[PDB]
């Protein structure tokens, strides 16, 4: 039946006219990766010491 479908597809953040979902981490990915780089160096720059 239409309402009691046992296969439940779950999206986190919906978008119009788009069959899937986009994660919540995607929206803050870039400042995530800019942390990554900026942090990476530091560890590398430590090892030179």
């Amino acid at each position: 039946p239409k309402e009691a479908c046992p296969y439940i597809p779950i999206r986190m953040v919906r978008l119009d006219g788009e069959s899937y979902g986009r994660s919540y981490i995607e929206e803050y990915l870039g400042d995530l990766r800019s942390l990554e780089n900026l942090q990476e160096a530091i560890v590398k720059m430590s090892m030179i010491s």
Binding site: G30, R33, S34, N37, L38
Partner: protein, 190 residues
């Protein structure tokens, strides 16, 4: 070689520092002053294209060996040759290029090199023409007409010419730190 309309003006401007103009320089056993200044001129050319400039370093160039001899030939035209990325593995040996890691000489396929090819007094920018003329004038001053004050002013004026020509190289080929290199091109990808 052959007369060049700009090169005779260069050898004349070497002798503009001391004395009188010669004419056309086209004889081997000749006016000793003209051939002497011309040797100083070509040495300062070979040194001033040696330092590595952004219009001189032909970046991804490919050399190919001879089909019979199976050997690509190092030349005195090939001014200084380095490899593309790092830990350059190419050196001159006999007049031929040579691997100091593969421990071999014969090359099957081609080879990718950052090479500098020797160019004339022509085919250079006017900044570098004035810098070769003034540095060769300093050398020609110091070696034949040993006068102190003209050496002082040619030293100061070589420094000014090198100032202008570094301004040319930092203006020819705009180098930006954070959007053009190989490391912090990726760090600023969002």
């Amino acid at each position: 070689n052959v007369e060049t309309a700009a090169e005779l003006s260069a050898v004349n401007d070497i002798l503009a520092s001391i004395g009188e103009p010669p004419v056309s320089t086209l004889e081997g056993d000749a006016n000793a002053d003209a051939a002497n200044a011309r040797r100083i001129l070509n040495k300062i050319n070979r040194q001033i294209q040696s330092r590595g400039w952004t219009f001189n370093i032909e970046e991804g160039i490919t050399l190919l060996p001879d089909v019979y001899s199976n050997l690509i030939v190092y030349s005195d035209d090939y001014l200084s040759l380095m490899s593309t990325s790092g830990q350059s593995i190419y050196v001159n040996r006999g007049g031929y290029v040579y691997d100091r890691t593969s421990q071999s000489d014969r090359f099957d396929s081609g080879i990718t090199v950052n090479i500098i090819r020797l160019r004339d007094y022509d085919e250079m920018p006017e900044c570098f023409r004035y810098w070769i003329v003034t540095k060769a004038s300093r050398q020609f001053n110091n070696r034949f007409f040993g006068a102190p004050e003209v050496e002082g002013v040619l030293q100061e004026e070589e420094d000014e010419a090198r100032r202008l020509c570094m301004e040319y190289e930092m203006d020819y080929g705009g180098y930006n730190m954070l959007d053009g290199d190989a490391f912090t091109s990726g760090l600023l990808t969002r």
